Ligand binder design. Structure first.
Ligand code: HEM
Ligand code: HEM
Ligand code: HEM
Ligand code: HEM
Lengths: 141, 146, 141, 146
């Protein structure tokens, strides 16, 4: 569970993300595709080329969802219900892939928020992404 | 694989007692049941709505036999699983879009089925050797992903 | 989240384990040590030889806790509080290991309860061990 | 590793800019902070009660430098990691009893540290090369476990 500290940390760092969430979402996807190519098996229908509008479009969607989880940090299971359902019933992404995205999301933030990406914030953000991942995967079986 | 002559014999010998037909249909059905999300690649198979419906589905059974078949043939090339599954590896990547993690899930399911079947015979040391093979096979299948 | 069918399935299966749970505890560990030799890193102080009384004794301990968990299938978090503490603050086993012991436990049950190890029961037990794992690793951070 | 020449150059170029003393301390400190369970191996290090306690602990800093020192050497023998790391692998297993998963956690932490430090210079593709590298080291370090 996320502590008050964690919540402050996450709202703070995500606060800084601001209007760049979209671009950061897209960047995280690209890093994942390049480092963990097995993740591409879920996007056979996408142009995964550098600067793909599809990836760009997808990045915004993921960022918007994360932004929505920060906005409802005290009720994530409910704020994310719909997406939990989608992932469980349609997309059916294997759980291990969540940790790969999380990781690439951490890299992107680190690369963009040098001043806020402190040890403490890093830890809070990691626990956060783990929680989001747990929710999205909660209805799998 | 990294199989000790002894570990090689243990694998080899148990396998000789395996009914590929039955084991393959069971491994694959159990996979679809324990890890429901694997059903994403078998929409065209039909009714997978229930354990009973999966285990009974003949499209499932027949696919199971084809999978164990190829697996079975791989045990003959334990010194080069990589070269043995190269084309199967490209196919799974390039045509099927199967996440290699699934290879791992099946491997584990496979081990549960063998235990299920051979009870006593499937000792800790025999499980160890099979674990190295399933790992080995999954690795070989994942090998040409890009 | 365990469904009513799951809880049933689990109580049935474990019901059959009976006086052999300790023995199955021991056998699972033995299978784990051999199949995943990295797990031995948490037992440097044990005699990991076949039929070692340390392994035997530990097997019992694990079995009993599993039993307790089946009994409180409904209140796991609370039934295993002390155990979650122990693992989080003392033992500090890496979470990847819980999946390895879980698998070895399935294998063991499979091998000993042929009639009862149906596909539906296999599914329930897996989810159960996953739940137990989650609980035992919930206070890690 | 499975490093294209251009991947090997990119690893090497960036690594030239790294302050192993500093990155070492940062990576190890962050590991004990993000995955507190990892602290199990350092109870003789003293106070690790808070992030400041960890990040600033002279012992953690010194150890981190040692670890990254060994890692840097690894980067010059990218052709024979298993070879390079054999005695260390033996030590971690037989003497230290360090679960190899720790090596993957550290690899991930290190990649975040490089991202932290190099910003935009840590491009998607440079990250992909480092991912291959930290995985190779982790594997090399686990090779002698038994
Ligand atoms: C915490 C991490 C994740 C978040 C926040 C997230 C969120 C989303 C969102 C918001 C959508 C779009 C749904 C819509 O159309 O309204 C989506 C779709 C999708 N996601 Fe997830 N997701 C996550 C993890 C993953 C992972 C790890 C994968 C696989 C590597 C994945 C695979 C997909 C796929 C294949 C789609 C459908 C895309 C399309 O065809 O347009 N997701 N996700
Ligand atoms: C032991 C590991 C596996 C082996 C040796 C294997 C082998 C095979 C073989 C020999 C085929 C026949 C298709 C052809 O040759 O054109 C096949 C097809 C296929 N496999 Fe795999 N497979 C394995 C694991 C898996 C897993 C775990 C999944 C998904 C859960 C999967 C999904 C598929 C699908 C969707 C097809 C296409 C069948 C069709 O055309 O209807 N495979 N596999
Ligand atoms: C299925 C999930 C698990 C359960 C229910 C469980 C339960 C227990 C129990 C009941 C004890 C003994 C507590 C006491 O002495 O009062 C224990 C201790 C311990 N467990 Fe866990 N355990 C689980 C998973 C694991 C795993 C996967 C590992 C490592 C691979 C592990 C490592 C340890 C160690 C090292 C000890 C201390 C042994 C000793 O020094 O005697 N446990 N666990
Ligand atoms: C990149 C991977 C790593 C490398 C190259 C590395 C290298 C080293 C070296 C050179 C030493 C000193 C050897 C000696 O005392 O003779 C050492 C010691 C040690 N390492 Fe590793 N290490 C790595 C990862 C880790 C991790 C991730 C952990 C724990 C989470 C760890 C735990 C230890 C411990 C506990 C010691 C002994 C400390 C002491 O002197 O009391 N190492 N390592």
């Amino acid at each position: 569970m996320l502590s008050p500290a964690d919540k402050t940390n996450v709202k703070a760092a995500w606060g800084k993300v601001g209007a760049h969430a979209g671009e950061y979402g897209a960047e995280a996807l690209e890093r994942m595709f390049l480092s963990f190519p097995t993740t591409k098996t879920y996007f056979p229908h996408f142009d995964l080329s550098h600067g793909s509008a599809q990836v760009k479009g997808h990045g915004k969607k993921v960022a918007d969802a994360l932004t929505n989880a920060v906005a409802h940090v005290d009720d994530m299971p409910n704020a994310l219900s719909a997406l939990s359902d989608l992932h469980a019933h349609k997309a059916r992404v294997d759980p291990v892939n969540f940790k790969l995205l999380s990781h690439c999301l951490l890299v992107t933030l680190a690369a963009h928020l040098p001043a806020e990406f402190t040890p403490a914030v890093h830890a809070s953000l990691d626990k956060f992404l783990a929680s989001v991942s747990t929710v999205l995967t909660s209805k799998y079986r | 694989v990294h199989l000790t002559p002894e570990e090689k014999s243990a694998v080899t010998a148990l396998w000789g007692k395996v009914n590929v037909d039955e084991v393959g249909g069971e491994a694959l059905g159990r996979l679809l049941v324990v890890y429901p999300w694997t059903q994403r690649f078998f929409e065209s198979f039909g009714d997978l709505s229930t354990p009973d419906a999966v285990m009974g589905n003949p499209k499932v059974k027949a696919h199971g036999k084809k999978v164990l078949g190829a697996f079975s043939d791989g045990l003959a090339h334990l010194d080069n699983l990589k070269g043995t599954f190269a084309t199967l590896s490209e196919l799974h990547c390039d045509k099927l879009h199967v996440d290699p993690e699934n290879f791992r899930l099946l491997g584990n399911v496979l081990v549960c089925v063998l235990a299920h079947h051979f009870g006593k015979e499937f000792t800790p040391p025999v499980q160890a050797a099979y674990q190295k093979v399933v790992a080995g096979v999954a690795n070989a299948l994942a090998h040409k992903y890009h």
